[PDB]
């Protein structure tokens, strides 16, 4: 990975603007071991500038927060709202939620990461002869 | 195995003559002298291996290709004997009238390397063939005038037991493969930094493992083992083998040495069908082809042939 | 040659053990030549 | 793929108006990867063009968003709306949602994946012999 | 008739004797790897110097999904076919197996 | 298939007749390959019919809408209506929805379709000795 | 290609079943038909099908 | 070829009476033990001197 | 030796029956002495 | 020796079968006469 | 041990067949510029009726 993909989420994903340092220094540098020399070229650019954008998704936005602070640690569900009197109900996720385990890691939650799941399988067959 | 063997059973003994005035001393010398008894086995194996092939007599002070007898000639002048394969000769005519001695056999002989022609006459040849052709006026392909290889029955037996040798000799390396699933494998894989500390640890936590060492694994890695099955394939390579030995004609206590997978040699008919082979080719295929020869060298003895001398 | 009334032990509809079965001639010509030729049981 | 399958979609998906630098730059050169010369003739235009249609729907339009920025990372199904009182309920999408699993990407969510599905399975047999 | 019954037969078994035991492995997504040029190469390239080797002395490493299977024939009572056949032929040609097949 | 069956579903299909553009150029290209001169003779044209428009239909209306633009990329199905008070509720397709799957095309959907599967049953057995 | 040496590909859903036949006692089956073939020639099997 | 047909089937067949018979153990949450050396160690000293 | 052009029977890279096989030499100074003297079978 | 590139057929590292084998000498003072006066086997 | 074709009258009796077809085809011709010269270093007299 002779170039790490900095600085071009902004632009490819058009939501995230709002900090530069908690995205570069913060994620970028725990991604990109994932990416090898060992995948194509149309690759090694949006794969990392994918799985990037689901760990800040997974928090709230970019340094965990928008401009409300408004995060919760455990990322429970939104089943129904209703504002004609204030009501919520929420989802249970404590080891494991909607099938989604609980000794993985679960890549398959949002977009940013579903679009890395289909470009880690295609450049990662998996076999060992060890 | 099958082009050698029954030829070289052929002259390993041979030929006690009958009449001693001194002179069945001396009518050995000159067949030791021109080395007979090992020319005719060289000449029979290339004739086994290949169409065909002709050992040519030399008479001193003889021309050519003429209607060539060397049986008048009463001296003690015998010098030449070369063997040569269908290779080196050609039998570049056939000759279909129905009159003629040596009737469908080619009349001439372009024979030599280099310097000359050298037609050549068949009655100063010796001719010899693995199999006789059926219909040797229809015959194609290179030998025209020759006879047929004795690879070209026994092709189909042959490479039948030669590829389940190499098939069952493979499967033993394959005796037990042990596989390992691991939950998310797809992921581990998928840098080389990552799975180089994955394939380090594993080579020396399965390097070890048997009957000393026991394996630790986590409760979600599987370590299945599939076991090949082995079950009669012993007595499937012995019945190709037969049928190798009856394509050669050679029973299993000749052919594969004295095998322990021979239970029909009773201990007085071993192997008498197997001389019974032999000595017809010694009295159909060495008799009547030597008869240029073998009046000629009883002849080069100091010129006098007499009538009730045989072997 | 048997024949059951039940069971249909020598119909030649029903049964096919030798009921159903005849022969053909046969001829050849050519593969005479390749069958001496290229099979060690036929030479 | 002599031809890049670029700026077709506008035609020949008529919804698909917005922009043309989020889409061809930006998906078209995700995409046509999966196509071969391998495949038929008629096949190499409309799968590209449809899998990349997938890639746009999955995200909100083209470039993520229509003029309403309302655009939410999980694509959580909506199933029961109400606007007398305003009511919503919501699905449940954690590891898998409805007959969709977690470790593989699923074609079968849309339309322009669907038209994808059915030309991918004509046109690749599935069998290796290595 | 008696010598085509004979060598069909050995034609056979001789070809079994290739697929002794054929084995398989089920990917989970094979319909989408195999649908490019590009793609499958890079996996069918590794599964060449994965399955290789594999024996005795070397083992395969998997994913939990996939399956490895393998199918062993049988070679069960073949070997007295084999010999029932050559009878029938030693017989039209009025030759014992003491002079046809050599001393079998 | 010496003949495509182009704009002929406005006779034989009469709710179809809002353009004949999105109808013979768009989807009479894409769906003529399962039709085959093996087939019977009274088959080759009303199956190609038929299974057109399945594909218009499973969008909106030919040009994927009629004069109200208001389709969705994910044909969802209603479950309940009311207009009393404005109130829907919706059906969960996600992976499969319904004894719908989700690694084939599902052709029992519309009717314009099942009349092609038992068609295509007919004509097409399913055997092979490779 | 398939056998020893090449392992085929396939994928979760396609099945591969493999239906091995019997050969079980059709040999003994075999030889008691010829003897009731040479009883009815009333020629032993040391002649009728050669030295068996 | 005869020659290297018998020489390696002798030394594939001598090389699993090695593993004539090799058993595993699967641990529940075996993935955290082996997470560093202090820890690893105090597992795998102990399961020596139970397997021994 | 052989060689079938598929199903790899004789290639080198493939099949490992003996198509993968060769020798390499070996010695022994001290360990002579060590067989000899505590193994029945050298002795 | 043999030693296969593939399937490591003589690898001393991988391969256990001949590959890692060796001899240590023994020695024995005291256990010789144990082992005459109470083993039938050594008597 | 797995020998169960040695009859005890014709145990080796084609091994020795074989020699036989060495010693009278690869060692007998080719020694004919000795064993005519050995026999003459008898003090240079060479008889006819001399032989092995």
């Not at chain 1, 939104?78 to 890549?107: C, P």
């Not at chain 2, 006026?137 to 040798?165: E, F, H, I, K, R």
């Not at chain 2, 071993?270 to 001389?275: A, E, L, T, V």
């Given at each position: 990975n002779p170039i790490p993909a900095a600085s071009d989420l902004k632009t490819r994903y058009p939501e995230f603007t709002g900090v530069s340092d908690a995205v570069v220094n913060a994620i970028i540098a725990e991604v990109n071991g994932m990416?090898?020399?060992?995948?194509?070229?149309?690759d090694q650019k949006p794969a990392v500038l994918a799985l990037a954008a689901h760990m800040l998704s997974r928090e709230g936005y970019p340094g965990r927060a928008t401009n409300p602070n408004s995060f919760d640690p455990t990322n429970r569900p939104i089943l129904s709202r209703k504002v004609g009197d204030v009501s919520t109900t929420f989802?249970?996720?404590?080891?494991?939620?909607?099938?989604?385990?609980?000794?993985?890691?679960?890549?398959?939650s949002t977009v940013y990461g579903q679009t890395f799941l289909r470009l880690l399988r295609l450049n990662a067959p998996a076999v060992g002869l060890v | 195995?099958?082009?050698?063997?029954?030829?070289?059973?052929?002259?390993?003994?041979?030929?006690?003559?009958?009449?001693?005035?001194?002179?069945?001393?001396?009518?050995?010398?000159?067949?030791?002298?021109l080395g007979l008894q090992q020319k005719l086995?060289?000449?029979?194996?290339?004739?086994?291996l290949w169409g065909g092939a002709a050992i040519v007599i030399g008479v001193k002070d003889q021309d050519m290709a003429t209607p060539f007898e060397p049986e008048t000639v009463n001296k003690d002048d015998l010098v030449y004997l070369t063997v040569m394969s269908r290779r080196e000769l050609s039998p570049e005519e056939l000759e279909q009238d129905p009159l003629d001695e040596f009737y469908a056999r080619p009349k001439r002989y372009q024979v030599s390397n280099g310097r000359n022609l050298s037609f050549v006459h068949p009655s100063r040849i010796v001719h010899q063939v693995g199999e006789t052709h059926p219909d040797p006026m229809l015959?194609?392909?290179?030998?025209?005038?020759?006879?047929?290889?004795?690879?070209?029955?026994?092709?189909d037996a042959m490479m039948n037991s030669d590829?389940?040798?190499?098939?069952?000799?493979?499967?033993?390396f394959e005796a037990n493969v042990d596989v390992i699933g691991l939950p998310d494998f797809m992921e581990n894989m998928s840098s080389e930094v990552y799975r180089q500390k994955?394939?380090?640890?594993?080579?020396?936590?399965?390097?070890?493992?048997?009957?000393?060492?026991?394996?630790?694994?986590?409760?979600?890695?599987?370590?299945?083992?599939?076991?090949?099955?082995?079950?009669?394939?012993?007595?499937?390579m012995e019945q190709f083998i037969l049928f190798v030995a009856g394509a050669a004609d050679i029973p299993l206590t000749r052919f594969l040495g004295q095998s322990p997978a021979g239970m029909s040699s009773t201990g007085q008919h071993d192997m008498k069908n197997y001389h019974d082979r032999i000595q017809s080719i010694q009295t159909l295929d060495l008799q009547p082809s030597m008869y240029r020869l073998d009046e000629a060298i009883i002849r080069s003895s100091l010129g006098a042939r007499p009538e009730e001398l045989f072997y | 040659s048997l024949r059951s009334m039940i069971s249909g032990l020598g119909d030649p509809l029903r049964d096919k053990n030798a009921s159903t079965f005849h022969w053909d001639r046969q001829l050849d010509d050519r593969q005479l030549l390749y069958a001496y030729r290229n099979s060690w049981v036929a030479r």
């Amino acid at each position: 990975n002779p170039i790490p993909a900095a600085s071009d989420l902004k632009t490819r994903y058009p939501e995230f603007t709002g900090v530069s340092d908690a995205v570069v220094n913060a994620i970028i540098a725990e991604v990109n071991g994932m990416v090898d020399d060992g995948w194509e070229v149309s690759d090694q650019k949006p794969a990392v500038l994918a799985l990037a954008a689901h760990m800040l998704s997974r928090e709230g936005y970019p340094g965990r927060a928008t401009n409300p602070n408004s995060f919760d640690p455990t990322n429970r569900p939104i089943l129904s709202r209703k504002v004609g009197d204030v009501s919520t109900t929420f989802g249970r996720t404590d080891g494991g939620a909607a099938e989604g385990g609980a000794n993985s890691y679960n890549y398959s939650s949002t977009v940013y990461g579903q679009t890395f799941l289909r470009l880690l399988r295609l450049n990662a067959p998996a076999v060992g002869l060890v | 195995k099958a082009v050698t063997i029954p030829a070289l059973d052929a002259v390993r003994k041979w030929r006690d003559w009958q009449a001693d005035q001194k002179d069945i001393s001396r009518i050995e010398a000159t067949e030791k002298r021109l080395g007979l008894q090992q020319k005719l086995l060289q000449c029979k194996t290339l004739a086994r291996l290949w169409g065909g092939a002709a050992i040519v007599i030399g008479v001193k002070d003889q021309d050519m290709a003429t209607p060539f007898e060397p049986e008048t000639v009463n001296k003690d002048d015998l010098v030449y004997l070369t063997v040569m394969s269908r290779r080196e000769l050609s039998p570049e005519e056939l000759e279909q009238d129905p009159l003629d001695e040596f009737y469908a056999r080619p009349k001439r002989y372009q024979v030599s390397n280099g310097r000359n022609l050298s037609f050549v006459h068949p009655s100063r040849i010796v001719h010899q063939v693995g199999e006789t052709h059926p219909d040797p006026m229809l015959a194609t392909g290179v030998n025209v005038g020759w006879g047929d290889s004795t690879l070209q029955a026994l092709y189909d037996a042959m490479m039948n037991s030669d590829n389940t040798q190499a098939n069952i000799a493979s499967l033993v390396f394959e005796a037990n493969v042990d596989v390992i699933g691991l939950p998310d494998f797809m992921e581990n894989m998928s840098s080389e930094v990552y799975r180089q500390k994955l394939l380090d640890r594993f080579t020396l936590a399965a390097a070890g493992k048997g009957i000393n060492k026991t394996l630790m694994l986590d409760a979600e890695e599987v370590f299945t083992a599939h076991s090949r099955s082995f079950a009669n394939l012993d007595k499937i390579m012995e019945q190709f083998i037969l049928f190798v030995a009856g394509a050669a004609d050679i029973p299993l206590t000749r052919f594969l040495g004295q095998s322990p997978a021979g239970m029909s040699s009773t201990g007085q008919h071993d192997m008498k069908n197997y001389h019974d082979r032999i000595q017809s080719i010694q009295t159909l295929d060495l008799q009547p082809s030597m008869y240029r020869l073998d009046e000629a060298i009883i002849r080069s003895s100091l010129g006098a042939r007499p009538e009730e001398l045989f072997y | 040659s048997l024949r059951s009334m039940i069971s249909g032990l020598g119909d030649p509809l029903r049964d096919k053990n030798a009921s159903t079965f005849h022969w053909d001639r046969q001829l050849d010509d050519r593969q005479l030549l390749y069958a001496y030729r290229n099979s060690w049981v036929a030479r």
